[model samples]
Target chain A: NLYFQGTRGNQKIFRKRMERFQEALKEKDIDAAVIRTLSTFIYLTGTKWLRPSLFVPAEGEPTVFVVKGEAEEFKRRSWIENVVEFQKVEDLMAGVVKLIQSSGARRVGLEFGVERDAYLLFFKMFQRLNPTVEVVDILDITMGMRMIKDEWEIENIRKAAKIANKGMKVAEEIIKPGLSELEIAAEIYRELMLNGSEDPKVYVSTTPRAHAEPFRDLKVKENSVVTVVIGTDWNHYYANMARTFVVGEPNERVKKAIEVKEKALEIALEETKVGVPLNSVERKLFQFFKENGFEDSYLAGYTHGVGLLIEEPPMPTIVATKVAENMVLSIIHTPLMIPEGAIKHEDTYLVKKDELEKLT
Target chain B: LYFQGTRGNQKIFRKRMERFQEALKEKDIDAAVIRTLSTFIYLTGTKWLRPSLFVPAEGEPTVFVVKGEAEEFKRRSWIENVVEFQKVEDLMAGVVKLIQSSGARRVGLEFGVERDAYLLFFKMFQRLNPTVEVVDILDITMGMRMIKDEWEIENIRKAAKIANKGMKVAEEIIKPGLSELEIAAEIYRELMLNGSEDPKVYVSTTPRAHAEPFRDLKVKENSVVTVVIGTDWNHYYANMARTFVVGEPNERVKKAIEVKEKALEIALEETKVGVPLNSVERKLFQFFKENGFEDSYLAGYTHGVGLLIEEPPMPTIPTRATKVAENMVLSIIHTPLMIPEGAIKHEDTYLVKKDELEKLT
Candidate 1:
């Protein structure tokens, strides 16, 4: 049986995901696309069992080829059109091929960004059946569509943010000498659960000084500056937030680093607006730091979008495409200086029609 | 940041896996087979981030890729001998050539025992590299992973500790009116905080004589059973111990389960070096009936639990597989019958040795 826990408002998000897929099929040129991602499957259909790779035909109802024992569960839970059980591996392959052929899809697109083994099986089976069926990489096509947030998506993000805030509050209360890193992490998790979070992803990196290690486990020393990156997912929508706290009053050097990071984020947020090219936003942010003598100290330009995956679209850089309205981005502004200290802050934001809405 | 829990002790299993591959190589085999299964990856150098592909050139290791980030991580991990990143179309062909160059007469295969894909790969690889041979089915790979080692034993012990902690958390906190999902959430939080990457690997709560939806099943005045199965370093594990008294369990029901657990322990103790398979099963059954526990359960007796969860060397009728070895991991289960409530069963992991079987957690 598939187990899933999310906020109370996830039902609406699930419904909207189906509408998004249906809207994508309205494109004239695209015939059909195979849905391979676990997130996408959860979004489109409410089935949580990590089986039954789904194939959505352009003209007909969607088909799901699930394991033998799991078909009944899918039939009961999923709003999809059809479900088939393939007891044998060969039968499963044949069923996938048959679904494609019967759909009259001359050109089909498979979700290329899935597991390698599944992709290999799809490659072998499709080529053997219909050699002429053109396979296109539609990873971005689905991801781009998912970037835009609906009301339900926004609500889940808010729920996740509340959970993250509770975790941070727990950290603030529990910060003391002699507590192990594991104990601190456990407290954060416990607080997240009590705050109505189903699945909270909590991480803490503490050091006597900054930049000790990016993701290593280290014991917390007295008067150490500890950075806790607390993030949680609500019905697959993500909320990423971090706060740095010290055991004692911040030293002058640490205060200065924090000031620089705050200024960098302030400038980046002011420059970020709807209808602006993502590259331009990236350039302006980079130029702002460079002109301010923080170029060498900059670790990243910015981060963009959070949803099914930890990181997604609207990447803050010159090479990336522009940001669209309603696109969610997690802008992480970190100023780095070797042997001194590094200050980093991350918050989830939404691109409104005319401005940006900070979610966390 | 990626987090990995405790690593299972698979040293003995790894030796067997290496021997299996060496045997394949001795028959003019060039490439060793592998799958996405965690056991195979543990034997090789691939981690959770990498995909399932071939490890070619026998002596030298190479990883074929499908995802870019995984390919990058493989390079960063610095584990493989050689990394070959290729598109899907050229991956199979590249594997065939790599095998052929290393004087591989035939390549091994896994993923499924079905002949469809196996025969397909054989024909295609044979056509791609005409001289290379394709020998043996996927069963050879499964046979090698039939046992555990000291390292795996340690890993299982760590997992058991985690499970025990989670149980304690559940018992101390879970209330009578709370839903099963609520208890599950607390258990999951405990697991994740204690270094579990995937909290949902395996967690089940079975209320005594009550099977309600997970979200709505509230604890009542009955015996509550929660099975916490976890995986450390992708090594599978299970702890099927039960706890009761949501509001004071019936003494008869509690006593029946207690007797069943004791019987299971006795049966496991009886299983030593050179013990007959049916003899053990027969005696266990006789004890159950003699202790007034017959006609309670549908199942016959206990089976094995290991890498695949339920595996070979099972205890059944006409069982030809002889006495267990020092490293053979098996599960002993006893389902006790009660008049009103039905059966209560528990399972535990044990390693059979020369003199006695060591209980694993």
Candidate 2:
């Protein structure tokens, strides 16, 4: 069973996360926290127990008050010792209020920073639940924990990366003249699944594309460089891998452009250093583009952290966020000035203590 | 290409818009601002591939979508006055402003039980236009959708056919060393290639009593693996469950299959248009009881299936047992056998018109 095998021996992983959360909560007046995102819930409890509101108290173990799906599924996978199942939304809310009230929480934290689209609502619900405690948008602990991969998390990502590289290989072998992008994508998708990805999607954007999107029915041409974006998931962890393949040897003009793109990529790989602010990577990449006479090739937002969520926070862009060790990131080099269309080389990287390691 | 070719169901999309407008009028709302969720796609036949819809009572519908997919969104959706935005948040902000400036006094939103979607959009939209009264049309939309439109019927039929092809694949490749998870993977591949937008699988292995599972459960000999799976085609959900034996089934497995099929047959017979959903559930449970197998059967026989995998009018619920209506799509019957020995259950969408029920999957 995927649930059993995937969840096996994840107790240590779950406990490691709680230490960070407990430390953060102890520093603030916040006595407890609640969340709605299922990813964050899983990040805490290691349980995808339907759609449950996760209740994490300051002093005790977390409790998932569940609705719709089974609570046993939660108990089976999660390390948390407490779980309460309910049939309706009202009953679940009842459980949440009781715990907060009993705990005498003067101030509670809601995972609202990651929930801008949905926070105003939970804000209202928390307000309605009680006026005794203040509900503030807490810095999401789940995002911070998910952004950096532990040894266990990195192993799962490594597994997904294996599948992703295989998808690239499958795409490279399958793409030929007159083959539709959909046709090529289907094969690669299957290969990814066979190689251990639960849900794998490949984006086939060949020459003459406007911007990034899913594949159309357009057929490939011999001279065009086909760009394949492989985003594959295994046990909910995602690794993105991308590459561009020319059907034949590029022309002189295209070859000159490829040199500049390769040079820009070299600058990115060299400039990326852990402990430095992410802006350094962004600034240096753009600078290389400008200095190498390929200023037109520069684009905005080159990289993003990838793990539980495909595009996680702390973007490899013009921001003052530091690159932490063990953070997995998806990096892209683009706008290579190809005559036919856009070409790019995208891959995942692992931020280590000193240097960055390419994961895919 | 899937977007361009599969969006041919626009005439019915136009009809759906008109129906929503009519509902807004009946509810005394001036405009209805729409969104993109798995449910929203069923409402508009427009993939939230990326945007929001602003529907006026008697005017051209306006859609504000993100830029990259904006070209495809415009072509795919029936609304002609489609606007484009660059940032993801910019699109949300644009829709709020558009609704505010439209001189609309009242609006209806699908802010049903899903608090996250409803709360976020409602709070922002309400704050942007403080004077506007936002009403929840979750029930109205879902009730109207209870009866299938002609276009929806055809697309669901296509979806069911795809599921049947997937089921056939499962029947072929289900043997030892293959496992129950791989069967779903191959089935999902077929569904995606055939144009199911979002496909998911829920399984319970026979070895583990159709276990609360992972993707690595093995397919064992003489075990009846129950696979509950679905694929969304053109925003319509087509669910199919097959409880098949790995090899030649043993006596217990064979009897379980026969008993479950008989119960399913009884439920199908009770799936009448005038009959309440509760009546169907009651009859199915009665049959299981009389046959001395009540413990083997779960309590719900039918559920509303369309935009969602499962919606209201659930037969198992005492408070929400609405009567079945003509053109209503339902996936009837689930039989997860009680003991760990094995299980047999099958579900398929049916179009109920009068006393006649059309089995789609």
Candidate 3:
């Protein structure tokens, strides 16, 4: 199925994931971890929902809190048996507080992440509701498990990479001097969606933009360097990749920029080992860029972990995460920002001991 | 062009800025440092990620973008004062410096969702500028955005037109054997080809109130396929949903649909200027109870729809409720009766007028 329905066959995977999470919670001496972000919600529940909250206790059956009328359908989609229904945020928090009070939990876990659903407003509200309950940011605990993908996650990401490759092919074929950035993005989306990516993110930049939602007026011109970044998700597992395409013959600077980027990518791949800290690789790439006389033009981060969201934990720019086995990462992410365009070549990689499998 | 270019839209943006600036003065807040994407686009007349628009209570607004993007952003957006930053720390420093240089003490920040105002970002901002007192600018921004302007209305109108086309495509391709993903694929293709910049399509053959379509969830005989399309034109959104029954549905579904349709009519009738949204919500809840479908109902009756599919004044929860105002775009009949068959829903994006509802879809 395109949507992860938490079917009978995949129950064991979710069960194991829950076990590991519960153990992590116990290790942290947290009675329960409240999940509100969509990515982590999908990880625990095996399905996606809007405004979903999953309460994973250190022991016993975990409970899922969904909107009142949604509990039945949510149960059908997720493996959790203890499903609680609520009318609003107040109702939801009241239920959560009741669970905490009943369990006599001193410390509770919550996530501090980038998802819009996991807002500071809700976090502050939770604290205000339960004055004595100590709150711990469980982002580290969650990312600890999520950073290393299991077989099931890797398979889904591999499938997503296949779809992403197809979308990139569409971009390479249709991108011309006259096509607008929106047109190119639309074509790529069509290809991705038809191939079974429920939520596909495509950004087409004819100009120098690191990240952009495609603009209708921004059209590819003759000899323009166009950058297309595609993040295709299969069952919510994202495989992000980017490719810089030139419509016509490249200028001297453009050619040199491409060459330097390729060399930097080469160095990045070599440095991305199982035990290496990502920041060291970031520094290496930085020095490489500086040596090539392009340090001022490059973005700092060289790679980011790809998962539920296109960019998730193990972000080298924010924190120094050591490259680990079974971690799905998008490497060579740094783009050389020139006046022509953002020259880039990026791909998804699955890391193992002493080897890396390029997914896209 | 689906909508006017940024150059042509600058006049409306300038007008919007003046209104917001006036509101800032009225509130006695020195300036609002807008980092949220939608608000950034609202004030800047262009959509740029990591966009920072510094709007003082007086004087022209300045934009801070990434180092390589300032020149292009200046060309695309209405704002002329553009500053470039190499890192996030630099951007923070630049904004803090701007605040101090302006001698403005009371600064406004949005304590909102993700990009709107990240709590982490807010913490960092406070750490960087301890002297500046921060206020939530969400109210000031939503106060203006909730009431649609002529340009926003026109863009939303076009977006609604595309949404209609997408629904029509869904209606055409949907059959007993078609999977939810297939149905969504067709609609997305239709919307994208017709100039929808970023379309939100949700198809549910199964009973999911909010569904990202599943490939295996195929429509069967008597299956109720619900398609929700939120199509946008130039980043302005219009949300609409429709439900289709494959064959003869059960009596329960028929009754649910009937009640849902009547509720929509009642909602339209009750939705008038100066009428509080909670009052209409109460009426709908009572109607459901009278119809014996109270157990199957959801609480949210309607939500404000504009730049975002759902914004402030959204009565999804209890605390947030505002009166229906003129020129406000709303998605009515938002709450659907979640029956075992499916989520029986019939929603449309409507513009609130003096006497009647202008149904966009």
Candidate 4:
């Protein structure tokens, strides 16, 4: 049901993904990592967007199992080491056990974040099949590995950012008096397709006053200020951008709120640099906003880095993640109203050695 | 995240639904007859969709659950149902005990034909539940469902309005040089903005020679086609339509396809009371050949549409369903292929009745 046009970069990305799991194997002192997450499957094998029968062993080439009919397509598109086909779920699990035994793996790390029942079934089945091999939860290892962005990942995120920017531009041009929120969103979708981008995740909120909550309906009235947040995806890499616009000239209060949000974003971006502890960045941003008399308005300090998965490590709160180079963070500064309208401006940034590079 | 809007016919429809279950109980049946497989959660007050749950008792419904989320959502939805977790081995055993507790000698079931494994469960149920009996009354239940009770019709009408709004977005801005995949994606985004009507089942097929399995493909000048099929919150009612156009078509091919499509329209018009399904199909074939068009590229002449995409009472070559009745829903799709080009033609869902056929939307 899904197709992937295999480009050159796909192979390198596949290898890089495998290298991350291989590193996890070394850290955990396990023979191999068994991945069942769909995201991990797409990441390890450059099969584009697909849910495959995934079982990867650490020491040797990983086995990419798929439906009997999908085996050929997986073989054609994937740069993974091995590809296998199974007629039933049991056969697929058998293949996994066989691979584990052949690889001489004593310890197997499993992804338990997928379906809870399926995980339990697999856990019991694996225990009965390979009594000697240990099965452990490896969610943290997988999450940590995907937190940082690499070169290919950054490119895909940049592609997503371009699409999000186009969507934002289309919303601005199309928003006018008498235009429904549905009509505005429709124009955004049309422009996204016209610009050779997949449909981005878009939500519109039209209001006289902006609120902190993200829930908004699709009805726009005259003189209504509308906020649009669009999340773009390029081959599963996500970049989110939001913009707020008014139907007519903004009032003084609205202008002040927007200015305060923009300035907060500027300060947050300046504080993001390589080797900066994530907690320090959060404290500095929170301290600056409080000193400026915007503490009550500020909600979450800054947005987290996003790619592959939408909110990843280096989350801009007082989290314990080291700010390293190539980390793509979607930082947003918003001072939302408790009852009504709030203002927000967000963009994706890449952490560099000396300075933070704004990708969008 | 899914919200149900107010419908004019909800009052009457709710009464009918409650009575339908009440009738099942009157037959000394433990549980109600249910055909809301697609909207199992919405109907049964469960938020998850996997596995099957049957409520036997009236006060506290009994559910035999399989999936973890189904149990979790069941507790959250609060239907006052007594939940029982059942594995593959204990599935039949659990259901039998529940039926026995209802103090009924019989049980009502739905969609029995679709699942043959139910026969085994029924047999085991009879053994465990003591003198339990089974019967097929789907036609009678669905007969009441055919007449769009006010609320059911209104939700579908709202869904249609949303679809039309999304289509207008597609038609106005879908230009040449955009990939078919991109257009489909754009339509999906628009649909999402309009509360994204979570599709019970959806598929988008573009024009391809020899039926290549559905894939995300580029839209070409002479081969642009897309079909969006979906159901609303209730998930019982269904809506589907297809839009097709190339940048431009050759004069002869365009005219030929149009002629075939007009034949379909004529067939719809000719459909009336006491009209045989075979006669309508025969007329369609004769008209296509009369227009010097080959009927070789057709997959099916017509199909029944309802809770399931291709429902029972088909109008195919081997169909036993005869004589169009009032409140019979169907879809007439005429797909004709010319050399090097093809056209997939379809329109609104039609409700056939004694006097005339009324389009649902």
Candidate 5:
């Protein structure tokens, strides 16, 4: 029962999120926008299953499409009562065609953020049937609205971060020389699960490639650094924690590597307020590392947003999305191939107007 | 290092290797590129990290993983000739070099299941070499995987055994006042400690809507609960769904049990090789309707479960070329019903042979 999921308490807020999409439909030639991505579907409909589609017309409530497996769930989860099912392609084609005819819309918006989507082919069929109906991309309308977190979403992320931190906190004790990467990961994995989480992705990697592999049998050598990036999952909300452990007392080069990474992280976090651009934050991180003669050590600077999907929005390299208040980010500065060992330190944070609150 | 697994089971590896070749010949492709799909993982034992598998028609297959796990992925995965690369550019370069070395001009992806090629790699391939053709051999590979070898069966059995143990843990810890998260944690604790790779445990209480509470949802008393336990041991997966009452079922539960038990019996008897699979589904649908539960029936399909939760060919209404086959593994439908108040659901794993059905868990 997709309808049955999510907080009854959160339904009011979820309705507002849907209203934003419906409001976007008021724009010219955007009479209807179809949601096919599972992640985006979950955001709008409060539940998702195999092939769930939300046909949100500009004038009315969204119609949800699903397979037989999710009919009962759709009734319980959605604010809109219109839910349809299609067992085969012909049925699916017929259902969407009806939506087009009933809505009397010329434009149908499709989300093409990802390669695979449920309605991608169905909409293409609709176009073949009616060549005049214009197809438009409306991913930005929904994605833009999700950038700001609501009260319910904020609490879930906070809870997720709390669950995520436990694994990293326990990892500090679990990491040592002769311990295998999988062995350490297993412990942290167990800890997070026991404390209410799906399997946290414990990305355990030793020196040479700190973020290369998460769980492996590679034994941690003497004077090695192990970077463990653990993503704590609470329902769908996710928070990532990356930390490096030096097995033994490091040589000068390894000591300096941590020094620069630590200082660089501090600078990055200082620059990471609501008003800062993501690209600017990365530039400052690289500049700090370069000034300290650790330029080659610079990898990814800005920690991407964490939400329903672990790695969400704000890719600094792709586009410098302006940091918004309540949007969560991480401070991940992981460098590679130091004399003694490689090091990485990362934690999730909530970006407020004036201050950044560390969640994990 | 990702290279470090396999029971030295040549039979398991051979089935895939043979299937890859058949797909190559059938599709008229020179070689195949396998991404980190479940089929690839099952064929090669290593859980690759930042890696892709490129298999040539002749000679040994090569696995390209990130630099860190190159050596380990080399050892653990059954395939020989493992390559390492750090950047995506380097990985693409390495892939082309290996293809040229293998003298392969035509390449298939999933052996070519619809868009199984890595998005970046697919784009880069077109830019790198227009001469090489990419083919779709989805059915050849998926069909090969549909039938489980005995070795595969043995692993599913292992997964099922661990799942039963996890269910026992649920039965023990499931009481009033505790959150669903705690019960999930306990089930996971038992599953993981007892050798489960990824124990996906789901519980649905018989309180109607929202009864399959989030792990964060708190629990109360006097309700029937259905626990769905899917465990993976060394990558092969199996599932077991069970229905239990919080306190007492009284007498109404008996009818639900009969429905479940009868459904199982009908499935086992009807799931014969070469028989049309649609007939069996229609039979189950008829059985539910006969029980005076047509409108109350919540489910009516069979999904193949292996490395993934839902694989291909889930025939609710089958096509002309559909039937049960030898060694075909499917989810065993069990204790499930829909009523006015709430319901019950319990399903598990099953394997079909020539004339009989084997309930795995």
Candidate 6:
């Protein structure tokens, strides 16, 4: 069964990644890092599991926790050798605490982030169990390693991008007057899943909203703008893209907004380079929007890092993340928020040393 | 759109709001802030970007959303008072202002994961509102959610119908040499096309408690493939699981299935109105032990299914458990026994009525 998965061939890749992560932990004087989020778990284990919790020591083999029945199958799927099985939540916690105690490590690392898997209750429980151990937030260390994509990761992302492109094309083909947003999302999802985009995230909006989950009641009308955002994944690596479609002839304002957005995209593509702070590009996009008299209609964030999650570290909205080589970025992230609809144009890009490569 | 739906569903939502408000008043809590997606959708008619609904003890409810989304959210939801915030800080400030203006001293907040209820946000709220006491309102909200209303039942019924179609697709396409991902893809495609909102499909060729399909794990000639499909219609879930054997089953597999079927019958018979869920679970466990398959049996006999694939009143979680009651929707015979051969499972959605169980799937 492991042979059926393409990841088995990349066991060496996962091993090297783990080694580098361990090195990072050692450098930070952290004993072990407990990974809880699904995305981070997949990043280290090279496979997806439910209720994922991984304990990686700074100097030894990593141990993954699973339900009693799942250990065998999990071992076959993941490259990691140490596997522990638990029957209850309490047992899982006790086992984690015991592992920390056995490691005799004072400082343990945990992630405090937006994901649901990084539950505050679980974090508090971990702290309560190991009262003396110093707990540190390891978002920075993980983000530091995960921000840059390896060649294998890039190839998988490219595959995901092809699937996303197919999903977008399906969206355009099926979208027309009288169809609901949910129907359009369904059609696009069908295409994405059939084409090997596991865990695809599709969002279609007929009305103006910053973020949207397709609604069954919202119907498409003639000349109305439809925004579709598709985050298609290959082997759990995501390639996020978005495009706005018009059912009929667009109005003058929509046309002008698209022109401005296209020009701004050019600025982003030109300015987004290796070692350059994204704040400069963000300011430039805002200035361009101001000059075009569409400043009030524009969203603030320009780019977000894309990988395991559609939006990860290097998000310029919260903090100015520098454009680094090998990082996958979703450019033109801030769409023109108009009353008619969100005029959006976004694509996934791989930052190369010399130039940026558009994946979707 | 109105709560429950756009088509004359305001009364259902109004009663729900009134029920929660009454509970708050009885508990002596001033207001309850709804932030979780499912709870927010339960009270509010629609889901908006970065939204929060503030339900005061008595009076009209207020909704806060991102700046540009207010107009659309107003159009979608039934609430009259809509506040817009530019950022998280602004949102916190708005909630504090509302709390202060209402003279609410004891405010209710849900202790859970994700936006508006995350531990960090809870701490931030305490910091922002220095004098107000924060109370955990998870039980208050889940109390109302545990029992299904007429509108909720209809949505769950529709979800069950869609889940049936997805399972049928899985049965038709599953065969040797077919990867787990292929079966899952077919199931998802069928579910989505059949009006399922965000369907979840899990296919496992091997024994995995929670499996996300893998492209490489192909079905074997004699593989026991477990397909768990959770389909939703109008954001209400109907969960079902079935284990399919491609070819002839071994003696162990046959015996396990026989035991599993009997356990299912016992579970169905044991489950009744006013019956503790744990009691039914214990009976099932004893039956398994009597059959000499105790080691193979997994825990948790039943779970509640609603806005989430699994929610409150889930017997596995200590706090979420409760006695079975009328109008409660549950997935019975939830645990699957694991053997050296494979994991065997049979689960379906059922609605508990006054006299008997109504099989949904």
Tens digits of per-residue lDDT, candidate 3, B1-361, equal 2466633467778888999999999988998889887888788887788768899999988888777898888787778999876666677788888888898888988766646555567777788788888888777888889888777888889899999999999998989988888888878878877887778898987677778787667899977989888888878999999999888999988888889989998899999999988798889889989988777667677887877888867742245558899999999787767877887878899999888899998
Q: Give the Å error, residue B307, model 1.
A: 9.5
> For candidate 6, what is the TM-score?
0.93
Candidate 4 local lDDT, B1-361, one digit each (tens): 1244331222343354466567666665667434344324334532232335565536445455432223333334444444433223455656666666676655665532232212234434556666766654454455554444434555555556666655665576556555555556555656656653343212223332122112245455655454544444333344555556657766755675677568768778877766766678677767767777643334345555544445544522132546665656666652334333433445566667678876764
Instruction: Give all TM-scores, in the order shown.
Output: 0.64, 0.81, 0.94, 0.57, 0.82, 0.93
Local distance difference test scores for all models: 0.57, 0.67, 0.83, 0.57, 0.67, 0.83
Docking class for candidate 5: acceptable
RMSD of 5: 5.3
lDDT of 6 by residue, A1-360 (tens): 242335434676778789999999999999999998888888899888888889999998999998887888788777898999876666888899999998799999887666757865576567777899998889888989899988778888999999999999999888999998888898888788778877889889988776777877789999889999999888889998999998899998889888888999999999999989987888888898899898678667788899888888887643246788899999887768877888889999999998899999
The residue-by-residue lDDT of candidate 2 on A178-209, one tens digit each, is 87776677677778777766656677766423
Q: How many clashes does each candidate structure show, in the order listed?
A: 8, 10, 0, 12, 14, 1
DockQ per candidate, 2 decimals: 0.06, 0.21, 0.53, 0.05, 0.24, 0.45
Worst 10 residues of 4 chain A by lDDT: A208-217
lDDT of 2 by residue, B242-299 (tens): 7766667777677767788888888888778778866776787787788777655565
> On a 0 to 1 DockQ scale, where is model 1?
0.06
Cα error, candidate 3, residue A102 (Å): 3.5
Taking the tens digit of each residue's C-alpha lDDT, what string does model 1 give over A119-167? 3444545666778788766666677677887666777787788778878
Q: Is candidate 1 or candidate 4 better by TM-score?
A: 1
TM-score of chain A of 4: 0.80
- For candidate 4, the docking band is incorrect
Q: On a 0 to 100 scale, what is the lDDT of residue B45 in model 2?
A: 64
Sort by lDDT, top down from the best: 3, 6, 2, 5, 1, 4
Question: Taking the tens digit of each residue's C-alpha lDDT, what string does model 1 give over B1-361?
Answer: 1233333233443355467657665556557656444445545433432334555534545555432233333433333544433223456666766675676666766534211232334445667777665554344554555566555566556656666667777677666677665676667667656654433422223322212124434566565544444433234454444444555667776777676776776677677767765567667667767877644432334444544444556422132545555666666662323333332545566667667776664
The regions of model 1 sitting more than 4 angstroms off are A1-20, A26-32, A63-78, A81-98, A101-108, A114-135, A207-217, A249-257, A283-301, A314-320, A333-343, B1-147, B171-176, B189-226, B231-361
